[PDB]
Amino acid sequence: NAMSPIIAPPAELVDPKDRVQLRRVFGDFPTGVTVVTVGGSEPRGMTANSFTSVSLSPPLVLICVGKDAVMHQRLTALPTFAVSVLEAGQEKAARHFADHSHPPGVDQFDTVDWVLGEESGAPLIAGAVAHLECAIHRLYEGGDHTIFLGEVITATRWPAREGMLFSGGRFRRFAPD
């Protein structure tokens, strides 16, 4: 379009030092929503959108976990985890495991339906689009986060289920097609 340049909507220049502004550009890339879980005497879960498939052979995925998260230390202590890719109607689960809202000290899994993952020993979220059980193969430096590279040990999927969406800091849904 001839005028697209001068007609373009407001462009925001983003200073990467400006944490608020930077969060906004990071939020511009749409993603699904996962719950990463780990086992142990007190299992834990964390809603995460940083999940990324990495390699087919070998089968690898990654997740980025904040050093400020309880999950960070749980993962370094126990090098196996599960990923539950949430379905569109699972906002209850998404909220439950987000924003460090249910801290350690009491059971974090008493309000969400889950099944034990045999290979990971971690709770898997019932009703999810897919479950992946992974073994942590590498830890990579990621600034205020750590990049955990996982090797996929087993996985299950429900083809009739469609994933939740997250973008611009909000839950979204697909249009049919």
| Near a copy of itself in 54-113, by CB under 8 A | 54-62, 64, 85
Residue 71's SS3 state is: helix
The annotation status of 66 as a binding-site residue, yes or no, is yes
DSSP code at position 79: -
2 touching a copy of itself, by CB under 8 A: no
The annotation status of 163 as a binding-site residue, yes or no, is no
Applying CB under 8 A, which of residues 3, 19, 103, 106 lies at the interface with a copy of itself? 19
Stretches 47-55, 74-82, 90-98, 104-112: which one binds a copy of itself (CB under 8 A)? 47-55
Residue owning tokens 């087993």: 154
Applying CB under 8 A, which of residues 7, 77, 106, 175 lies at the interface with a copy of itself? 175
For the chain, how many residues are written? 177
d(CA 88, CA 33): 9
Residue owning tokens 């697909």: 174
Stretches 37-45, 69-77, 95-103, 146-154: which one binds a copy of itself (CB under 8 A)? 146-154
Distance, C-alpha 150 to centroid of its chain = 13
Partnered with residue 36 across adjacent β-strands are: 46, 83
116 touching a copy of itself, by CB under 8 A: no
53 touching a copy of itself, by CB under 8 A: yes
d(CA 1, CA 13): 23
What is the footprint of a copy of itself within residues 22-41 (CB under 8 A)? 22-26, 28-32, 34
d(CA 44, CA 18): 31
- Of 112, 71, 70, whose CA–CA distance to 91 is shortest? 112
Applying CB under 8 A, which of residues 2, 6, 10, 99 lies at the interface with a copy of itself? 10
Nearer to a copy of itself, 95 or 115 (CB): 115
DSSP code at position 163: B
Nearer to a copy of itself, 110 or 141 (CB): 141
Which parts are annotated binding residues for NAD(+)? 18, 145
